[PDB]
Design a protein around this ligand. Structure first.
Ligand SMILES: Nc1nc2c(ncn2[C@@H]2O[C@H](COP(=O)(O)OP(=O)(O)OP(=O)(O)O)[C@@H](O)[C@H]2O)c(=O)[nH]1
Ligand SMILES: [Mg+2]
Lengths: 300, 141, 181
């Protein structure tokens, strides 16, 4: 299935009365359609703008509130945007009909055989040099000697963030930075995805007070294939509170870091890897080399 | 090969009559349709009166041209082509001028109507024109 | 008996024929019937009172406007059915239909109707009017049109689903039956 996702970045909420720090990433939902027919090429037309119905996480608390009288005894809690995108994934796996009510989009589809060249050679009218390119996060059955790529898909998966003192589960924004062996952040290093330039440091989605949120958020990484051998990443987990001065003055309650090379020299083995989020002294955790000497993740 | 849409959603009119948009049947002999139209304005004497295109023709619909009434083609009742022909002719051989002027402009305009021409030619009202403009000068000169 | 002179107007092919043939004959016109105009009579019960209805499928056409304005005299109620799918019909109602009818006959009860009501949440009409840059008539927008034309009420109908039909025309009856302030 082709699946698109929307995160409403900007303000924490669409509510009037207070400013929010502009650029606050808030998830806004998903659209999915099977492409088993689209992959097989049965629908063969440039002009077909397939309207695709988009379903947000169900914010279903507008009309049902007004009419419930003569027996009121209910207290329910907020999972209507605290709803997991894993769970929304499961829903749309089950979900067949999307009552988007106009909230949807349009796409014109084909399949072009051959590689990027033939794509930009036989049908460059569709795909110029400036046309956006996405690659399967995987490997091909055919390998050209010299398949020069250096892609590293790093996926925020999920994480436990206990409430602690704050009754609201900390509104975790993860913001990770690619440094040299001296804590020096590199620009553009984190690439959000296709058709757009990387960024110096990356910011996660603010889950609205979620103790064990789940991200599924993947980013491209590409560094000098030799300087990556001497680079690391460091991580700030911050409670994006609804108060702008408080939001910016809020610090990374959580600290983390990770190294790009196993000290033996091997690149980190792929797959899942766990992280301890760090608190306490941040001078212990902001030193170009000292936190490098410090331990960073669960297994290590 | 097929006949037209035998049930046509048309207005039926008549001088003084509020049109009624009825679904007229067309395979019926047109005399009875004229009868029911007259009855609609509380009228008898159907053969004495003709429906016609309330549109430009004013051609008194006979059994022949009733295929030419479209959905929305207004029909207007009036005196039958014979009765128009006669009203004309006794106005025509007559002498009172302005009445002759009106009837004469109208005989001009309606002359092309074959349905009217049948009975105005059976009638011989053109010789009544011969009166009104060769004697009708000297009655009044 | 009692039959109310009820002329139903609205833009061309917006469901006047459709809604009226859903009410009088209880079948949805599958194809667009080109209305010139058709005078029906039906029987129905309104809030406990049985009543006849002398109705009109009248032309959305400006051409037979006159013929439709021929139905204008003697008319006791003006049921104006505008396409929810064509808010241009909303505009011509608030510019021609209600104006023209209140100019040939002021103070006559007027019942505003949103035809094709089934299409408001329906993806098809939404996306159509979006690529048309317009929005299917939201109920409050129809309420605004009704108060604009000082309508008795804005009532939404779906002739495809037989929806709203009988209620709309019971309203058309009661508006003459019991005038509202
Ligand atoms: N899907 C759907 N279509 C409708 C509905 N009501 C009307 N229509 C459409 O309206 C089209 C034309 O029929 P009408 O709206 O009855 O035509 P009209 O309003 O009488 O306008 P004129 O006949 O031109 O004077 C039909 O082809 C239908 O598709 C509805 O409730 N649902
Ligand atoms: Mg109509």
């Amino acid at each position: 299935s082709l699946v698109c996702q929307i995160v409403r970045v900007g303000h924490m909420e669409l509510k009037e009365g207070k400013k929010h720090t502009c650029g606050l990433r808030r998830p806004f939902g998903v659209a999915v359609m099977d492409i088993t027919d689209i992959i097989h090429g049965k629908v063969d037309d440039e002009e077909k703008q397939h309207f695709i119905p988009f379903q947000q996480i169900a914010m279903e608390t507008y009309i049902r509130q007004r009419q419930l009288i003569m027996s009121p005894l209910i207290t329910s809690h907020v999972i209507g945007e605290n709803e997991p995108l894993t769970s929304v994934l499961n829903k749309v796996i089950a979900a067949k009909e999307v009552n988007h009510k106009g909230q949807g989009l349009w796409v014109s589809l084909k399949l072009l055989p051959g590689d990027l060249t033939q794509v930009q050679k036989n049908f460059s009218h569709l795909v110029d040099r400036s046309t956006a390119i996405a690659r399967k996060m995987g490997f091909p059955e055919i390998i050209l000697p010299g398949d020069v790529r250096n892609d590293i898909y790093v996926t925020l998966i999920h994480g436990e963030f206990d409430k602690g003192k704050k009754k609201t589960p900390k509104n975790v924004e993860v913001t990770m930075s690619v440094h040299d062996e001296e804590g020096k952040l590199l620009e553009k290093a984190i690439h959000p995805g296709a058709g757009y330039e990387g960024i110096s440091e990356y910011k996660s989605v603010v889950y609205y007070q979620v103790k064990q949120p789940c991200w599924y958020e993947t980013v491209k990484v590409s560094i000098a294939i030799e300087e990556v051998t001497r680079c690391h990443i460091r991580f700030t987990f911050r409670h994006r509170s609804s108060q702008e001065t408080r939001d910016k003055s809020e610090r990374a309650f959580g600290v983390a870091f990770v190294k790009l090379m196993n000290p033996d020299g091997t690149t980190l083995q792929d797959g899942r890897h766990d992280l301890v989020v760090y608190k306490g002294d941040n001078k212990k955790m902001e030193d170009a080399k000292f936190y490098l000497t410090l331990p960073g993740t669960k297994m290590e | 090969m097929p006949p037209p849409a035998d049930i046509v959603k048309v207005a039926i009119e008549w001088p003084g009559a509020y049109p009624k948009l009825m679904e007229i049947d067309q395979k019926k002999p047109l005399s009875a349709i004229i009868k029911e139209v007259c009855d609609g304005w509380s009228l008898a004497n159907h053969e004495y009166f003709a429906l016609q295109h309330a549109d430009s023709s004013n051609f008194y619909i006979t059994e022949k041209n009733r295929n030419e009434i479209k959905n929305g083609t207004i029909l207007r009742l009036t005196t039958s082509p014979a009765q128009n022909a006669q009203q004309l002719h006794e106005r025509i051989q007559s002498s009172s001028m302005d009445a002759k002027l009106e009837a004469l402009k109208d005989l001009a305009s309606l002359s092309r109507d074959v349905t009217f021409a049948q009975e105005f030619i059976n009638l011989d009202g053109i010789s009544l024109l011969t009166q009104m403009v060769e004697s009708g000068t000297e009655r009044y000169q | 008996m009692q039959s109310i002179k009820c002329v139903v107007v609205g833009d061309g092919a917006v469901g006047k024929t459709c809604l009226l043939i859903c009410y009088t004959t209880n079948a949805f016109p599958k194809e667009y019937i080109p209305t010139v105009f058709d005078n029906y009579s039906a029987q129905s019960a309104v809030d406990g009172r049985t009543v006849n209805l002398n109705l009109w499928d009248t032309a959305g056409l400006e051409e037979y406007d006159r013929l439709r304005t021929l139905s204008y005299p003697q008319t006791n109620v003006f049921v104006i059915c505008f396409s929810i799918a064509s808010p241009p019909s909303y505009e011509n109602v608030r510019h021609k239909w209600h104006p023209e009818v209140c100019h040939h006959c002021p103070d006559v009860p007027i019942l505003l109707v949103g035809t094709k009501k089934d299409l408001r949440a329906q993806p098809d009409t939404l996306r159509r009017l979006k690529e048309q840059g317009q929005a299917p008539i939201t109920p409050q927008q129809g309420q605004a049109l009704a108060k604009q034309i000082h309508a008795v009420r804005y009532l939404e109908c779906s002739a495809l689903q037989q929806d709203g039909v009988k209620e709309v025309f019971a309203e058309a009856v009661r508006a003459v039956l019991n005038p509202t302030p």
